[PDB]
Amino acid sequence: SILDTYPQICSPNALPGTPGNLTKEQEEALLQFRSILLEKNYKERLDDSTLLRFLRARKFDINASVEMFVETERWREEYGANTIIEDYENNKEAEDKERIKLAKMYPQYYHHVDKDGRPLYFAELGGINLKKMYKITTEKQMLRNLVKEYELFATYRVPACSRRAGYLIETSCTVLDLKGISLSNAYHVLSYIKDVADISQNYYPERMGKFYIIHSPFGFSTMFKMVKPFLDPVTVSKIFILGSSYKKELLKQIPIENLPVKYGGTSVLHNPNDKFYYSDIGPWRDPRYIGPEGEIPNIFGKFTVT
C-alpha cells in the first residue's frame, strides 16, 4: 500500500512508454503482461512502474518482457536482493565500519536532485589506488554495495523524490568524475565494469536517467570502445562524455544550488569541515517527503552527513 502514498504517473513531459504517458497499444500490452505474470503466480513488483521498465527494455515485446521479468525474479531470490536491506540492518555496525574505509578513496554520494527531480549522484574515481582497494574490499563486495544501493534507491529515494516532484521519479542523474585516473587502471577493471553493466541491464532495466562522464583523460575514447560492446543501445544513449564545456552542460540539467562548487555550482556543505564522501543529502532526508517506508539507513554510520 506504500505505492498509494506517492505519485505513480510520470511527468506528462517524460519519455514515451512511461507510466501515465502510454499509447493505447502500450496500455493493452501492460495489461496483457501483468495478466501473464499473475497467472504464473507472481505477486510482488507488478506495479505500473516496474512492469513498464521491463516492457521499455524489450520494446513492448510481451514474451521477451516475461522472460526478462521471470529471470530477474529468479536472480533476486538466489542472490539475496529481496533481503539485502534487512541483512545490512542486522549487521549494520560491521558493514558501516568497512564502508567508511573506502569512502574517502572512492567518493560515492547523492546530493539533492536534478531539474526533473531525479536523485543527483556523484562518483569520483581519481583517488582510487587499485592495490590499496583490493586489500580492503573485493569485487563481489562492491557488487553487493551496488545491489544494496539499487534497493535503497527503490525503497527510499524514489518515494521521497516523487512526493517532492509531484510525479513519479524512476531514474538517477549521475555524474562520474574521472579526473586523475590512469587509463591503464581503467583497462585493468574492465571485467568489473562488465559485471556492473550486467547486473544493471539484466535485473534493473531502465534505471538510468542521465549519465555524465566528466574530466575523462585524452585516450578515454579508446578505452570506452572496450566498454560499448557489452552495453545495450539504450544504455549507450544515456551516457554523455563531456569536454572542457562540461560545467555548461551540467547546468542545463542540474539546478545551480544543487551542484557542488568544484563543478561550477554554489552548493556548499553547512559545516565546511564535513566531507561530501560521507554525505547523503536529498528529499529522502526531509520529514515533509518521507512516508510509511521510514527514513533511509545511514550508510556511513555516525559520519553520515544528512
Swiss-Prot record:
Pfam families registered for this protein in UniProt: CRAL_TRIO, CRAL_TRIO_N
GO BP annotations, alphabetical order: post-Golgi vesicle-mediated transport
GO cellular component: nucleus
Residue ranges of every copy of the CRAL-TRIO domain listed in the record: 98-271
Signal peptide: none
Molecular function per GO: phosphatidylcholine binding; phosphatidylinositol binding; phosphatidylinositol transfer activity
Misc. remarks from the entry: Present with 2870 molecules/cell in log phase SD medium.
Name of the molecule in the record: CRAL-TRIO domain-containing protein YKL091C
Source organism: Saccharomyces cerevisiae (strain ATCC 204508 / S288c)
